[PDB]
Every structure is written in C-alpha cells, then in structure tokens.
Design a protein around this ligand. Structure first.
Ligand SMILES: *[C@@H]1O[C@H](CO)[C@@H](O[C@@H]2O[C@H](CO)[C@@H](O[C@@H]3O[C@H](CO)[C@@H](O)[C@H](O[C@H]4O[C@H](CO)[C@@H](O)[C@H](O)[C@@H]4O)[C@@H]3O)[C@H](O)[C@H]2NC(C)=O)[C@H](O)[C@H]1NC(C)=O
Ligand SMILES: CC[C@@H](C)[C@H](NC(=O)c1ccc(F)cc1)C(=O)N[C@@H](COP(=O)(O)N[C@@H](CCC(=O)O)C(=O)O)C(=O)O
Ligand SMILES: *[C@@H]1O[C@H](CO)[C@@H](O[C@@H]2O[C@H](CO)[C@@H](O)[C@H](O)[C@H]2NC(C)=O)[C@H](O)[C@H]1NC(C)=O
Ligand SMILES: *[C@@H]1O[C@H](CO)[C@@H](O[C@@H]2O[C@H](CO)[C@@H](O)[C@H](O)[C@H]2NC(C)=O)[C@H](O)[C@H]1NC(C)=O
Ligand SMILES: *[C@@H]1O[C@H](CO)[C@@H](O[C@@H]2O[C@H](CO)[C@@H](O)[C@H](O)[C@H]2NC(C)=O)[C@H](O)[C@H]1NC(C)=O
Ligand SMILES: *[C@@H]1O[C@H](CO)[C@@H](O)[C@H](O)[C@H]1NC(C)=O
Ligand SMILES: *[C@@H]1O[C@H](CO)[C@@H](O)[C@H](O)[C@H]1NC(C)=O
Ligand SMILES: *[C@@H]1O[C@H](CO)[C@@H](O)[C@H](O)[C@H]1NC(C)=O
Ligand SMILES: [Ca+2]
Ligand SMILES: [Cl-]
Ligand SMILES: [Zn+2]
Ligand SMILES: [Zn+2]
Length: 691
C-alpha cells in the first residue's frame, strides 16, 4: 500500500545524519562558488531520487561581503589617536577546521562603509521600549553617539533602525552571556555554549518583505531595471558590526554616565552596565572608533526547484521549501532543515518509483540567499506570483529542524491547526519518558496551550524566514515545525557562529537523529496530507476562534483610552460583527463540506478552502509596508521575528498617547478598524454558497 504510513516509514534517521554531514563540511555562503556547487549537487540528487523535473532558478541580487584585504574592526582610541584596543578579526576556528578556507569573518551584512569615532551609549537590547526609557525617562540623547546593544529579544535589523532613528552614528552588536551562555554547560567544543571569541553574523536590513533591495515587486532577472543604491530598499544609514563578549567586556568596562535604570538592563559580564554616554573620569577622553569596509555587490544566487507532478490536480501546488545558504557551516541553520528536506524528497521519490503519484503537485525548494533577506524565495515568488496565487494550496517551511531537544514547536495559520493535531496523534513521541506515547501527548504535556486544556501551544507565524513572501504577501496557507528547548529553564547559543557545525549537532543536540526524524515526519506528513487528501485538510472554524481572540485583544488595547474612544466615537462593533458572521458562515460551510460523488462541488469546495487564506490579503498593503498585505497577521513593526495580529489597528494604537494630533491618530485607528472588519466579512463571504 502507498499511503502516508508507507511514506513515513521510508524516512530514516541515519539518512538525515549522512546528509547533514555532507552539507556541513565547507561553508556555503550565498553567492559563493561552494554554494553554487551544492545547488548543482542537490539538483542532481533530487533527479536521481525520482522527481519529474529539477531546475535551477537564478537571480542577480544585492549581497554584501567584507573586504578580504581591508578587515572590519572596532577600536578604543586615545586622545593622540593611538588605537589601544582592537576587536578580533576572526573567530578562533574550532578543532579540525583551523585550515578550512573561505570562512567569512564576523560582519553585519549590508552595513555601509565608514569610520565613525565617538562616545558610547549602552542601549540594552535596542528595542523600541529601551529607546523610550533612554530618551523619555532618562533624558539620554543618542544623537551623534555610537550605540552598543546586546543581541537578543528582537531581530537585529529592528535594533539598527531604532538606533538610526535615535540619531546614532554607529551600532555595535554583541552577544551577552546572559542571553547566549546557559549556566552549567561548557563552551564549544566541550558543550553547546558560546565562547567569548564567538560572534553572531547576520544581516541588518529592514526590507519589510521587499526581497532584493534593488528590484522590489519584480524578479531580479537578466533584464531587470535596478534602483540606484540611494533608492534601494531597507539599507541601514550607519555602520554596524558584531563582536563577542570578550571584546564587549573591554568596550563596556570603562563606561560612565548614568547607572543602568534597573536589573533588566544588566547582563552577566563583570561590568556595571552604565548607559553612558562615554567612559568614566580617567578615560573620559578616549573614544570608540569603528572601521567598516564591507561592500554591497550584485551577485548571482541559485534556487533549486523540484517538481513531483500531481496525478489528479497537477495545477494545485503544495510547496516544501527551506534555505541552503549559510553564514559558515550551517550545522543547524539551515542544514539540519535541508537534510530533512533531502530525506523527504528521497522518500516521496521511492513511492514514485513504485508507480505512486500524489493527488496534487508537490514543489520542493532549496532557497538561496535567505540569510541576506529572504532573497531567493522572494525573487522566485515575484517571478511566479500569478501561478502561486491562483494555484498555491500551502507552503511548509523547512529551515533548522532543531534548536533544542525538549519538545515540538509549531507556528502556522489556524487553517492548519486540526491537521497538525491529527497528524501528531499518529506519530510516535521521541521523548524520554514517553516511549509508546504519541507526539501529541508529549508535546501537549511539555508545551500546553495557554487557553485550552489537553491541547498544545501553536504560535502565529512571524517572519524572518522563507515563508514570508508566501504567507504575508501572497496569502498562501503556511506552516512550520521544529524541535525546541524548554524556555522556562533557560534561541541557541552558537547561532550564526563558526562553531555551529555538524559536531555540535551530533555530539550535543541529537546524537541518534531521532528529533530530526520526528521533524521529518511532521513536515513530510503535513505535505503528504495537503497534497493527497481528497478534501483539503483545512478547518475554517479554527480561524473563526482565533479571530475572536484577536478581536478581544485589540479591543482591550484600545480600551486603555476610554476618554478618547468617547471623544472620537471609536467603535469595534463592526469588527466583532464581522467575526460573528465569519463564525456563523464557517460553521455552515463546514456542514456542507461534510454533507456534500461530485468532483465539481468538491473542487469548488477545495477552491473555497484554498482561497480562504487568500481572502485576508488587501491589495493596497499595510501602511508604508506594501509587501505586507495580510490584514490578520504581519511581522511586528518592532521585531520582524514576532507575528502581530490585526497589525494595521495595532500599529495605529501603538504609543498613541504620544501623538501630537489625537484627532488624526484616532481617525486612523477607526480607518484600520473599518479595513479589518471589511476584510474579515469579505473573507467570510468567500465561504458562503457561491450562487
Ligand atoms: C454581519 O452580517 C449581517 C447579516 O446577517 C449584516 O447585517 C447587515 O447590516 C447592515 C448594516 O447594519 C444592514 O444595513 C441596513 O440595511 C437597511 C436596508 O436593508 C437600511 O435601511 C439601513 O440603513 C438605515 O439605517 C441606518 C442605521 O440606523 C442609517 O445609517 C441609514 O441612514 C438608514 O436609515 C442599513 O443600511 C443590512 O440590512 C444587514 N443585512 C441583513 C440583515 O441581511 C452585517 O452587516 C454583517 N457585518 C459586517 C461587518 O458586514
Ligand atoms: C536564534 C535561534 C534560531 C532558531 C532563530 N531565532 C529566534 O527564534 C529568535 C527570536 C528572537 C531573537 F532575538 C533571536 C532569535 C530562528 O528560528 N530565527 C528565525 C531566523 O532564522 P534565520 O537566521 O534563518 N533568518 C535570517 C534572515 C531573516 C531576514 O532577513 O528576514 C536571520 O534571522 O538573520 C527563524 O528561524 O525564523
Ligand atoms: C556529498 O555527497 C555527494 C553525493 O554523493 C558527493 O558528490 C559526489 O562525489 C563523488 C566522488 O567525488 C563523485 O563521483 C560524484 O559525481 C558526486 N556526485 C554528485 C555531485 O551528485 C560529495 O563528494 C559529498 N561531499 C562531501 C563533503 O562528503
Ligand atoms: C590596532 O590596529 C591598528 C591597525 O593595524 C594598529 O595601529 C597601527 O600600527 C601600525 C604599526 O605600529 C602603524 O604603522 C599604523 O599607523 C597604525 N594604524 C592606525 C590606523 O593607527 C594598532 O597598533 C593596533 N592596536 C593594538 C593595541 O593592537
Ligand atoms: C481531524 O480528525 C477529526 C477526527 O477524526 C476529524 O473530524 C471528523 O471528520 C469526519 C470526516 O468528515 C467527521 O465525520 C467527524 O464527525 C469528525 N469528527 C469530529 C469533528 O470530532 C477532522 O476532520 C480531522 N481534521 C482534518 C482532517 O483537518
Ligand atoms: C578592498 O580594500 C581596499 C580599500 O580601498 C582596495 O584596495 C580594494 O578596492 C577594496 N575592495 C573593494 C572595495 O571591493
Ligand atoms: C539631541 O542632540 C542634538 C544636539 O547635537 C540636538 O540637535 C537634538 O535636538 C537633541 N534632542 C533632544 C531631545 O535633546
Ligand atoms: C538534551 O537533553 C538533555 C536532557 O534534558 C538536556 O540536559 C540537554 O541540555 C539537551 N541538549 C541541548 C543542546 O539542549
Ligand atoms: Ca525583486
Ligand atoms: Cl522552519
Ligand atoms: Zn535559516
Ligand atoms: Zn540564519
């Protein structure tokens, strides 16, 4: 029999392990020859695995690299201009990799060039609320200062935008052991903790979903007309550089000016965490100087696209995608996901060789340049947007399979909640103490839902990964699943460092590759069901439940301002009405879906299921973010990684007590309530009888 069990049983932990090892021996930085060679290898193997067609789709996009002969570094400089302390030029390479070439040194991708010299201000995590505290409460002025911020809590691009808007002239990012060193575990190579010389690479763009900075809206193909650099999307205006905590200690230890305002501003280093500006009395004339010489360069990137043509509905696409490019070895990010995809393709191909085909078409993708701003997935979706929005059933992401070994973590559209519950009840838990129990049971025990007993936590989709264009721009139902850590006893310390290797995973995270296998079963099982179930496995009623929860939430934010709501007649009545209607219509649609031999009624109904996520797209986009078009979910304006619900209303309400023209500010709240109520009602109406 060719069924989901046959698919799942064919997956092997040992294969995943072999693929991970194969993908992590050399760096695969976007735009480099090594990553093109890997793309060609994957294309060749997916063909031998049995896919119908496997092509490379290439684009020429803006990337960023350090200058090999003019290294980036930061100094403390004395009044004579002697550089008395220099940060490191590279991370000490791990055992047995000290002779590996082409390890990119730590840098912040897309930093402009410069050599700004100034007094430091310490800004905690450089969050919106951290800058509010400095500027509003502490009266500290960042204008013309070099800001030093600890990584953590929010996407680093948002930190840089926040620093830039505060008037900073440069930003130094560092990893504090409070956020990247778990008490009682040793530093790599003896444990999974970050050494003091370890440094997190990463881009600092604010693209808001645009893709390649030079071609927003359109694929960066051979004849593309590119913006000039000055009009490019999302580039920072000030130099930025990341350092480890050995170097951070040397920069912070001399800091003077005001004390930290409270303990939430103190990390774990033996320094006072003074905010500044500048250094204490004896060192008051020393300054900090950055030296950044990285260059932005249009560079070719390559996605691998594999197709397994559907037997019955070949014009319906279920997509499994994850990136291939890495900062260095990519032992977790992304190759622990890419090895899983590879094994999933292998299993589907085994079934195909025996005469099986899925009902719908399955597309498999190995995306390039994800680390430089989701560039590969976004350009390809821009090229294929018409096919995707008329034919795209679902997108399942497949980046890092593990960031811990504790329990499952799922982020998805509500349309997939029932699918995920049902699938995980049929899978075996890999956890110690749950042998013979279902993954649903272990997951539910370890990560209970905050609102429903006997159910697991499932989070919103945020952003910062390759599902963004499919979900937030095009409105295709999207999901992701990975193994995670237990937050309450404690993402991973060695993220984006040279120390993230095959050995890290094999020694400290998943020696038996059983968590990888469980993740392969969840991702692959989701894809199987989406591509094969007669009726698409989406339950519209789960969207109705969450819509009410988000409506309650946004109403409760607004209700902190009862006087203004009276003055400006701010009512949420239309939004609750739309949600009530969605609930009623979804319930009726569900009855018909179960009560309807008619392939036209079925496909009509499958089309209503597929276009339901699509109905939440507003073609005008959110304010000043034209590529975030989903009205229910957008990446938080303060942290790209986090999802925000009813983002247009949320952002209109945010910090509203500070706006100088309240009439105008509350008018825009009302406008966003109208947009949201209308979109919910329009989405509901796509589920009504069609004529
Ligand atoms: C949720 O679904 C319900 C349907 O079950 C839907 O109800 C509709 O509400 C609208 C807006 O309230 C109703 O509009 C009315 O329509 C009549 C004609 O049928 C008009 O005469 C009304 O206008 C008069 O009264 C207004 C209010 O006092 C005045 O402002 C106006 O100047 C007129 O004097 C009014 O337009 C509509 O009839 C119902 N439809 C039904 C019951 O079928 C509701 O709108 C849905 N929610 C959302 C958010 O869409
Ligand atoms: C660091 C541990 C990781 C498993 C990680 N991080 C977080 O969950 C997280 C949350 C808050 C935070 F401040 C840092 C990390 C995580 O999953 N991050 C995101 C980002 O993954 P990626 O590194 O592949 N994406 C790139 C590029 C993102 C973009 O350009 O939009 C990046 O974040 O630099 C994700 O997987 O969706
Ligand atoms: C990763 O695995 C691939 C595929 O098995 C290896 O590439 C093959 O290498 C052999 C021996 O050099 C060649 O004869 C094949 O033609 C290659 N096949 C391809 C590219 O499809 C590759 O050597 C492995 N890499 C590492 C680091 O182990
Ligand atoms: C930090 O690095 C800088 C740059 O390499 C060093 O300063 C240079 O020292 C050389 C040799 O003494 C001089 O010829 C250059 O003129 C200096 N360059 C600059 C830009 O000042 C500096 O010595 C290093 N500091 C420490 C403590 O190692
Ligand atoms: C998840 O599984 C449940 C339990 O089997 C499914 O709900 C059943 O669906 C069948 C087939 O239409 C109905 O006859 C039953 O009445 C349903 N039982 C319930 C709601 O308790 C549900 O459809 C599955 N979800 C999917 C496939 O997305
Ligand atoms: C790198 O280093 C120096 C800086 O001027 C120069 O010789 C070379 O052009 C630079 N490479 C670039 C800017 O791409
Ligand atoms: C902060 O610094 C500069 C002084 O160079 C000034 O122009 C700016 O208005 C100041 N802002 C505040 C809020 O003090
Ligand atoms: C793996 O699981 C064990 C048992 O809970 C835990 O002590 C260890 O910290 C885990 N490893 C990682 C990398 O989280
Ligand atoms: Ca583009
Ligand atoms: Cl993922
Ligand atoms: Zn990744
Ligand atoms: Zn990454």
């Amino acid at each position: 029999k060719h069924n989901m069990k046959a698919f799942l049983d064919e997956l092997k932990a040992e294969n995943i392990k072999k693929f991970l090892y194969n993908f992590t021996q050399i760096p695969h930085l976007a735009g480099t020859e090594q990553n093109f060679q890997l793309a060609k290898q994957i294309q060749s193997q997916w063909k031998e695995f049995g896919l119908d067609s496997v092509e490379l789709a290439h684009y020429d996009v803006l990337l960023s690299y350090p200058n090999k002969t003019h290294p980036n570094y930061i100094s403390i400089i004395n009044e004579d201009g002697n550089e008395i302390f220099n940060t490191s030029l590279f991370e000490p390479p791990p055992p047995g990799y000290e002779n590996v070439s082409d390890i990119v040194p730590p840098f912040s991708a897309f930093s402009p060039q410069g050599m700004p010299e100034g007094d430091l201000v310490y800004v905690n995590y450089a969050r919106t609320e951290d800058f509010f505290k400095l500027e509003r409460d502490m009266k500290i002025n960042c204008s013309g200062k070099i800001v030093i911020a600890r990584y953590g809590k929010v996407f680093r691009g948002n930190k840089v935008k926040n620093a830039q808007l505060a008037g900073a002239k440069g930003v130094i990012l560092y990893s504090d052991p409070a956020d990247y060193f778990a008490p009682g575990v040793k530093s790599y190579p003896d444990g999974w903790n970050l050494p003091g010389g370890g440094v997190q690479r990463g881009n600092i763009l604010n693209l808001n979903g645009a893709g390649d900075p030079l071609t927003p809206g359109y694929p960066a193909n051979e004849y593309a007309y590119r913006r000039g650099i000055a009009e490019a999307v999302g580039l920072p205006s000030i130099p930025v550089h990341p350092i480890g905590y050995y170097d951070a200690q040397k920069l912070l230890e001399k800091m003077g000016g005001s004390a930290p305002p409270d303990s939430s501003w103190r990390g774990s280093l033996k320094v006072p965490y003074n905010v500044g500006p500048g250094f204490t009395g004896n060192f008051s004339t020393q300054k900090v100087k950055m030296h950044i010489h990285s260059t932005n360069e249009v560079t070719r990137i390559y996605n691998v696209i594999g197709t397994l043509r559907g037997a019955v509905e070949p014009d319906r696409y279920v997509i499994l995608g994850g990136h291939r490019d890495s900062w260095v070895f990519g032992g977790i990010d992304p190759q622990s996901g890419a090895a899983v995809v590879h094994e999933i393709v292998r299993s589907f191909g085994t079934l195909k060789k025996e005469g099986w085909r899925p009902r719908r078409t399955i597309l498999f993708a190995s995306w390039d340049a994800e680390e430089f701003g989701l560039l590969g997935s976004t350009e390809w979706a821009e090229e294929n947007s018409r096919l995707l929005q008329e034919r795209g059933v679902a997108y399942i992401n497949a980046d890092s399979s593990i960031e811990g070994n504790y329990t499952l973590r799922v982020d998805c559209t509500p349309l997939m909640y029932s699918l995920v519950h049902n699938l995980t009840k049929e899978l075996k838990s890999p956890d110690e103490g749950f042998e013979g129990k279902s993954l649903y049971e272990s997951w539910t025990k370890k990560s209970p839902s905050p609102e429903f007993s006997g159910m697991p936590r499932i989070s919103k989709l945020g952003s910062g990964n390759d599902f963004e264009v499919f979900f937030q721009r095009l409105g295709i139902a999207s999901g992701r699943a990975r193994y995670t850590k237990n937050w309450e006893t404690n993402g991973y310390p060695l993220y984006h460092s040279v120390y993230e290797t095959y050995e890290l995973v094999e020694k400290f995270y998943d020696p038996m590759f059983k968590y990888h296998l469980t993740v392969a079963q969840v991702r692959g099982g989701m894809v199987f069901e989406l591509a094969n179930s007669i009726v698409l496995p989406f339950d519209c009623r789960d969207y109705a439940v969450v819509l009410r929860k988000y409506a309650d939430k946004i109403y409760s934010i607004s209700m902190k301002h009862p006087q203004e709501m009276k003055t400006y007649s701010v009512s949420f009545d239309s939004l609750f009405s739309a949600v009530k209607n969605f609930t009623e219509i979804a319930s009726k649609f569900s009855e018909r879906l179960q009560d309807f031999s008619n392939p036209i009624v079925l496909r009509m109904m499958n089309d209503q299921l597929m276009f339901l996520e699509r109905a939440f797209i507003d073609p005008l986009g959110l304010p000043d973010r034209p590529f975030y078009r989903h009205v229910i979910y957008a990446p938080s304006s303060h942290n790209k990684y986090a999802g925000e619900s009813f983002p247009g209303i949320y952002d209109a309400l945010f910090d509203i007590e500070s706006k100088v023209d309240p009439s105008k500010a509350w008018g825009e709240v009302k406008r966003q309530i109208y947009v949201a109520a209308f979109t919910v009602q329009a989405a509901a109406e796509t589920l009504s009888e069609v004529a």
